[PDB]
């Protein structure tokens, strides 16, 4: 029940966040990442 | 942190062992180099409008007055096929040369030091890096710091204690709804607002967004001594 | 950042629908095929150069309905949602000059 | 481009390092002023001056771009260099390359088989050289544009998603922030400097 | 018209599709040319 489909490319989801004159978002936890990078 | 790090190293082994397309940048180098070397060998079998692609088919077959004309066509064709190969490899070396100077830069800044260039030594805030060799290339493991969980807080630029505006020295003011603290921008570590964590400048009648609150004096308990 | 993506049929440029010309071109080897791979490889780089520049973020953001930015007027830089093309007044000057 | 503005204007430098954290704009510049060895008292005490200077400076960009035609000379040369290669590629078809005539029909329908093949062999060898000259040119021009994109890719990261301590990289002077704008086959940065 | 066909005119030859247009040829003109010396217009030798 599969086939090939054509569509308009998505640019990513929308994550509009609140903005105001008096609000701030400070993090409470963290996380260590390890990203790979290959170069010739 | 030690467990978050050792856990991430294990994921790299899984991704590299399963996804062979991670090293696609290095396979395109050997493949493009091999296609050009194969293209020259195929050009040898071409006639270029002559009687035959082979020399012995012409040297011992035709006379020198006519063989030199047929021989000149192969030499004219096979020679252009070299200039097309040397030219391509001489251009590809520049793209490799730019990648080497870049990789050398990352082996200096990201590895031998701590960089502050955004997204240069890996996505996120850079801490360190660990290089790893590979065939005709180099691999980096960029260790980084990323905040994960957030919380909304009500902030303000300055605080009015008794007519004087108290700006912070490090971090920024926040509020848990009723009480105000000082905390670093990139981590929630609240502290009591005191003269040591602040800096006085001007008055409250100029700064915009200022609020009224009290600043704790460290010399308070000495008054009752 | 980018160039105009182009491709050229190495046969039709030389032999303009000529069977005799094509029969002789077939004896020259893969000169015809090489030129299509080069121009094709170039066209791909002009599509990567826009991803390595503009697509620095997978996540799309938007401005709020109330544009309070402490007295800074960004109306000339931000896009005009009332226009057909979602571009700014300064972007209009660049796509016209 | 509209996203990077909404991130820079409202989140600053955090959306380029994970999740986006809200920071007001007047509080953003205070950190940025501290990022260049300037205490942040000068900002809050003079917010009206910083805004009138910035908004007045943005207006000069419209008048300058709308009046100076040579401003976009870098992107027009990329288009002109390519079109000259195309017309040059087509004009060579009208050349004879030492043959009886540049047209195959004037040879194939005029001369006998064993004679026409020689005249056709020159045009094939001549026209094929024009392509390798074109392909090699665009193959070099694709290298210059590739370095200009890798440069702009860095400026969209260091100057836009943060604050650069590199001198004369993100604009002349002490850098605060940047605001990109699109263009045909290129980008245009609006660097802010102190 | 509106069909891929060859051309054998009084002074023009080639292959393409003929369509009506708003162009105009002088009484002393038969066929046009673009910037690249390539033909892109023609007047009929019998009809106007």
From Swiss-Prot, chain A:
Glycans are attached at residues 21, 29. Changing residue 13 to V: In strain: Beta/B.1.351, Iota/B.1.526. Changing residue 16 to L: In strain: Omicron/BA.2.12.1. Changing residue 28 to I: In strain: Alpha/B.1.1.7. Precursor of the fusion protein processed in the biosynthesis of the S protein and the formation of virus particle. Mediates fusion of the virion and cellular membranes by functioning as a class I viral fusion protein. Contains two viral fusion peptides that are unmasked after cleavage. The S2/S2' cleavage occurs during virus entry at the cell membrane by host TMPRSS2 or during endocytosis by host CSTL. This is Spike protein S2. The lineage of its organism: Viruses, Riboviria, Orthornavirae, Pisuviricota, Pisoniviricetes.
């Amino acid at each position: 029940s599969q086939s090939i489909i054509a569509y308009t490319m998505s640019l990513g989801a929308e994550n509009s966040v609140a903005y105001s004159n008096n609000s701030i978002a400070i993090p409470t936890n963290f996380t260590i990442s390890v990203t790979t990078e290959i170069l010739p | 942190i030690a467990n978050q790090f050792n856990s991430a190293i294990g994921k790299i082994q899984d991704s590299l062992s399963s996804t062979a397309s991670a090293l696609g940048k290095l396979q395109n180098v050997v493949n493009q180099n091999a296609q050009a070397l194969n293209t020259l060998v195929k050009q040898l079998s071409s006639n270029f409008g002559a009687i035959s692609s082979v020399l012995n088919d012409i040297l011992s077959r035709l006379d020198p007055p006519e063989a030199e004309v047929q021989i000149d066509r192969l030499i004219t064709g096979r020679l252009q096929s070299l200039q097309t190969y040397v030219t391509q490899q001489l251009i590809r070396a520049a793209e490799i040369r730019a990648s080497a100077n870049l990789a050398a830069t990352k082996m200096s800044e990201c590895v031998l030091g701590q960089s502050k260039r955004v997204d240069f030594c890996g996505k996120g805030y850079h801490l360190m890096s660990f290089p790893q060799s590979a065939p005709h290339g180099v691999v980096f493991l960029h260790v980084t710091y990323v905040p994960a969980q957030e919380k909304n807080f009500t902030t303000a630029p300055a605080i009015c204690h008794d007519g004087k505006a108290h700006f912070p020295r490090e971090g920024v003011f926040v509020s848990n709804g009723t009480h105000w603290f000082v905390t670093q921008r990139n981590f929630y570590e609240p502290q009591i607002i005191t003269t040591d964590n602040t800096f006085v400048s001007g008055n409250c009648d100029v700064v915009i967004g200022i609020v009224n609150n009290t600043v704790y004096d460290p010399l308070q308990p000495e008054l009752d001594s | 950042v980018s160039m105009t993506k182009t491709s050229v049929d190495c046969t039709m440029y030389i032999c303009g629908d000529s069977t005799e010309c094509s029969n002789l071109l077939l004896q020259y080897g893969s000169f015809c095929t090489q030129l299509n791979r080069a121009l094709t490889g170039i066209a791909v780089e002009q599509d990567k150069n826009t991803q390595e520049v503009f697509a620095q973020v997978k996540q799309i953001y938007k401005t709020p309905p109330i544009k309070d930015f402490g007295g800074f007027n960004f109306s000339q830089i931000l896009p005009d949602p009332s226009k057909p093309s979602k571009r700014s007044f300064i972007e209009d000057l660049l796509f016209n000059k | 481009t509209s996203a990077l503005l909404a991130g820079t204007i409202t989140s600053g430098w955090t959306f380029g390092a994970g999740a986006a954290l809200q920071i007001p704009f007047a509080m953003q510049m205070a950190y940025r002023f501290n990022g260049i060895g300037v205490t942040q008292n000068v900002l809050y005490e003079n917010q009206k001056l910083i805004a009138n200077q910035f908004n007045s400076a943005i207006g000069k960009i419209q008048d300058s771009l709308s009046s100076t035609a040579s401003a976009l000379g870098k992107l027009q040369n990329v288009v002109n260099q390519n079109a000259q290669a195309l017309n040059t590629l087509v004009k060579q078809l009208s050349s004879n390359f030492g043959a009886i005539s540049s047209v195959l029909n004037d040879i194939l329908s005029r001369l006998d088989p064993p004679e026409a093949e020689v005249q056709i062999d020159r045009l094939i060898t001549g026209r094929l050289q024009s392509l390798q000259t074109y392909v090699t040119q665009q193959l070099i021009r694709a290298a210059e544009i590739r370095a200009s994109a890798n440069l702009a890719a860095t400026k969209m990261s260091e100057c836009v998603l943060g604050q650069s301590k590199r001198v004369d990289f993100c604009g002349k002077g002490y850098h605060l922030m940047s605001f990109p704008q699109s263009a045909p086959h290129g980008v245009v940065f609006l660097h802010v400097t102190y | 018209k509106n069909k891929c066909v060859n051309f054998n005119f009084n002074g023009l030859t080639g292959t393409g599709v003929l369509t009506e247009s708003n162009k105009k040829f002088l009484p002393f003109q038969q066929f046009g040319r673009d910037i690249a010396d390539t033909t892109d217009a023609v007047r009929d030798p019998q009809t106007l």
